Amino acid sequence: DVSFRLSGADPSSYGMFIKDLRNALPHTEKVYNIPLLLPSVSGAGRYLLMHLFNYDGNTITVAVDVTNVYIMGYLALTTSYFFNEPAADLASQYVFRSARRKITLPYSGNYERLQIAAGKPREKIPIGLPALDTAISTLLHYDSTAAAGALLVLIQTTAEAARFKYIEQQIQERAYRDEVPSSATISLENSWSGLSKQIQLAQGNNGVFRTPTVLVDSKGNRVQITNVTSNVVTSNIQLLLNTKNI
């Protein structure tokens, strides 16, 4: 398991968390020096438990699918909650079985559905360490509309930061003041699958992508990534979704 406490948190302790989260995900190969997540993992070992504590010391445990860094659900006191999707229903066979009751949330976990439920796109939802503390707090008691927003924060500040050093840095810069994500951050989130695929297809193609990936950069300019020499590949991306899952 991995843990993160908001009480006393700073950029360093957050970076240690995100490093622990990355290191907890299994891999047997690197591709261009980036860990390649596994095609599949059977049974319970498929799910990492993240223990998150708000500033007051209250806690939820979040279940994460180690093949794709997808959050499946969470435990808050004696109630478990899972996304309304088959992968989460499967996860509920393995994690938090000791919950006194299990609630299926009224949406799946993908960004489009969560934004619909929350009533706003994630361009408009501030993220940061304060936002994470609020998210955890919200998730402690069921409210499905409030939870959608909370989960959009939680996904970005855990999984998406594990995937991209740039995103991890963006949260660090919001350690004490929330701010909506940069467009670059949004772009990288949306491109993770595509990037992961193209980096893998590059291996038998002399480091060249079969299909260019369009990102937004730090300055809000849209740019094409065509090969493994790009800083998105050498510096930024930390985890690859296996092509078998794409």
Token representation of residue 161: 């930061």
85 labelled ligand-binding: yes
Shortest gap between Cβ of 236 and ligand NAG (angstroms)?
A: 12
Note whether 193 and 246 are within 8 A (CB). yes
Neighbours of 180 (CB within 10 A): 17
Q: What is the rounded distance in angstroms from the CA atom of residue 134 to the CA atom of residue 2?
A: 20
Contact window for ligand NAG (CB under 6 A) among 59-67, 157-165, 167-175, 227-235: 227-235
70 touches ligand CDP by CB under 6 A: yes
Q: What is the rounded distance in angstroms from the CA atom of residue 187 to the CA atom of residue 68?
A: 18
Please list, in sequence order, all residues whose beta carbon lies within 8 angstroms of the beta carbon of residue 205, skipping any fewer than 6 positions away.
Answer: none
Q: What is the rounded distance in angstroms from the CA atom of residue 209 to the CA atom of residue 200?
A: 9
71 touches ligand CDP by CB under 6 A: yes
Partnered with residue 2 across adjacent β-strands are: 50
69 labelled ligand-binding: yes
The alpha-carbon radius of gyration of the chain (Å, integer) is: 17
Name the residue nearer to ligand CDP (CB basis): 109 or 128.
Answer: 109
Site for ligand CDP in 96-125 (CB under 6 A): 109-112
Shortest gap between Cβ of 57 and ligand CDP (angstroms)?
A: 25
Note whether 149 and 120 are within 8 A (CB). yes
Site for ligand NAG in 196-225 (CB under 6 A): 208
Shortest gap between Cβ of 229 and ligand NAG (angstroms)?
A: 4
Nearest residue relative to ligand CDP (C-beta): 109
- Applying CB under 6 A, among 62, 105, 127, 155 the residue interacting with ligand CDP is 155
Site for ligand CDP in 179-208 (CB under 6 A): 192
Q: What is the rounded distance in angstroms from the CA atom of residue 158 to the CA atom of residue 153?
A: 9
Helices 144-155 and 111-118 cross at an angle (nearest 10°) of 140
159 touches ligand CDP by CB under 6 A: yes
Looking at the annotation, which residues are catalytic? 160
Residues making up the binding site for L-ascorbate: 71, 109, 111
Annotated binding site for UDP: 69, 111, 163
**Which residues contribute to the site for ligand NAG (CB under 6 A)?**
208, 226-227, 229-230
